[PDB]
């Protein structure tokens, strides 16, 4: 459905763009967004899809927007409206000053000093799941990889129960990617269903995990209370489900269908962390955005009181304006420009951890699996929302050309 045009947008500035299902969404989902950036397309255009709402199309619009929460705010994040205004996450849903104080405590439980002590059990479940896929010679490696390494990891480091992850990880798609069944409203108040009495178990008998650590937390030296704890565990639990999750299948399509990357990480290995970046900016995936909080006249074109704008994260680095040959991959780039974990004050917290379980993923997977192809006759199929990702992919090799370690 279509929304009416709003008085104040110009007809010239309207291309009808659909998030959740972008018209060229069987190219790709990137090549489906970066139809945003043919040449024809204004820097900031009004699609009347999903309630009617602003893109920013570009990098340096994209940028500028996440810096400048004065006018840019984060308390309706999400489109559809009806979604950002549940939206109530914490951080992403506080704009500074308030924000500041909870990213440190969001950063106890999924920064670097957690990651860097989670380290030996990130490694030993990627070789573990890599191994025993390895002599089968083939997967569907979203469900048989991509799921369970980044969300096994996740729900370890949260003291949560691994059967308790099929309905958490319908609840977070239905946030990221709605199939119709649920509004952002009803998965959220589900998904608070399942946290609030874990946060009181652990607030009268705290753990060692991520919920309790959250839930007994202080936040600029006072207590958090048990609102904010499930408004912040919401939020993790989100990131650790919908988000390396997705990610990987990106860059093991990719991986399947270019071998000769394939044999640049097998032949150079030291150049893996850099892939990761490449792999990153080329398959970037998260888009979300910001309600405008007064008239604002941006680059141009009036925005405004209450006017959404969608700045999608995934977009910066594959305009052509901040790299050249954006669609090209090259692990040799020399500024690999992106912000594919965000910019400004709400720039991602756990990327540390998805880089170590991206970077960890590819060293595992290409020792023991270093030679494999998409599934014969298989056509790869995207899918869009607020977090892109791939619905499946079949992989295939011959286990002769493996190696147990
Ligand atoms: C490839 C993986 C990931 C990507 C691309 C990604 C992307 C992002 C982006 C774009 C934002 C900013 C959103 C905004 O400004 O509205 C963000 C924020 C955040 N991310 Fe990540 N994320 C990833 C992984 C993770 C993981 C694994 C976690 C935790 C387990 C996590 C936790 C967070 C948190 C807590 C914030 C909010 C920071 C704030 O609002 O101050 N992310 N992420
Ligand atoms: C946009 C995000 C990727 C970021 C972390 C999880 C996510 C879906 C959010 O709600 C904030
Ligand atoms: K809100």
Same mark, same amino acid.
């Given at each position: 459905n279509l929304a009416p045009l709003p008085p104040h947008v110009p007809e010239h500035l309207v291309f009808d763009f659909d998030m959740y299902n972008p018209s060229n969404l069987s190219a790709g989902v990137q090549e489906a967004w970066a139809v945003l950036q043919e040449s024809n397309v204004p820097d900031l255009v009004w699609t009347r899809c999903n309630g009617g709402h602003w893109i920013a199309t570009r990098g340096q619009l994209i940028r500028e927007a996440y810096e400048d929460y004065r006018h840019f705010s984060s308390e309706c994040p999400f489109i559809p409206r009806e979604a950002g205004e549940a939206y109530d996450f914490i951080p992403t849903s506080m704009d500074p000053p308030e924000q500041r104080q909870f990213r440190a405590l969001a950063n106890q439980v999924v920064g670097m000093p957690v990651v860097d002590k989670l380290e030996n059990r990130i490694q030993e479940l990627a070789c573990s799941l890599?191994?025993? !896929?390895?002599? &089968?010679? &083939?997967?569907?490696? #979203?469900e048989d990889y991509a799921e369970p390494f980044p969300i096994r990891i996740f729900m370890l480091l949260a003291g949560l129960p691994e059967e308790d992850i099929p309905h958490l990880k319908y609840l977070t798609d239905q946030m990221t990617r709605p199939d119709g069944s649920m509004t952002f409203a009803e998965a959220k108040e589900a998904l608070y269903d399942y946290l609030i009495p874990i946060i009181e178990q652990r607030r009268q008998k705290p753990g060692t995990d991520a919920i309790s650590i959250v839930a007994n937390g202080q936040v600029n030296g006072r207590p958090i209370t048990s609102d904010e704890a499930k408004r912040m565990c919401g939020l993790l639990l989100v990131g650790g489900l919908d988000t390396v999750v997705n990610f990987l299948? +990106?860059?093991?399509? +990719?991986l399947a269908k270019s071998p000769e990357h394939r044999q640049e990480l097998i032949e150079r290995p030291e150049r893996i962390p850099a892939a990761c970046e490449e792999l990153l900016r080329r398959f970037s995936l998260v888009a979300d955005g910001r309600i405008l909080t007064s008239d604002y006249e941006?680059?141009?074109? &009036? !925005?405004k009181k209450g006017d959404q704008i969608l700045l999608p994260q995934m977009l910066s680095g594959l305009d052509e304006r901040e790299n050249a040959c954006p669609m090209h991959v090259d692990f040799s780039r020399q500024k690999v420009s992106h912000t594919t974990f965000g910019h400004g004050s709400h720039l991602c917290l756990g990327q540390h951890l998805a880089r170590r379980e991206i970077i960890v993923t590819l060293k595992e997977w290409l020792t023991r699996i270093p030679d494999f192809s998409i599934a014969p006759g298989a056509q790869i199929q995207h899918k869009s929302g607020i977090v892109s990702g791939v619905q499946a992919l079949p992989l295939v090799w011959d286990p002769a050309? #493996?190696?147990?370690?």
């Open positions: 890599i191994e025993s !896929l390895r002599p &089968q010679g &083939q997967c569907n490696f #979203t299948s +990106f860059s093991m399509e +990719f941006f680059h141009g074109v &009036q !925005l050309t #493996t190696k147990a370690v």
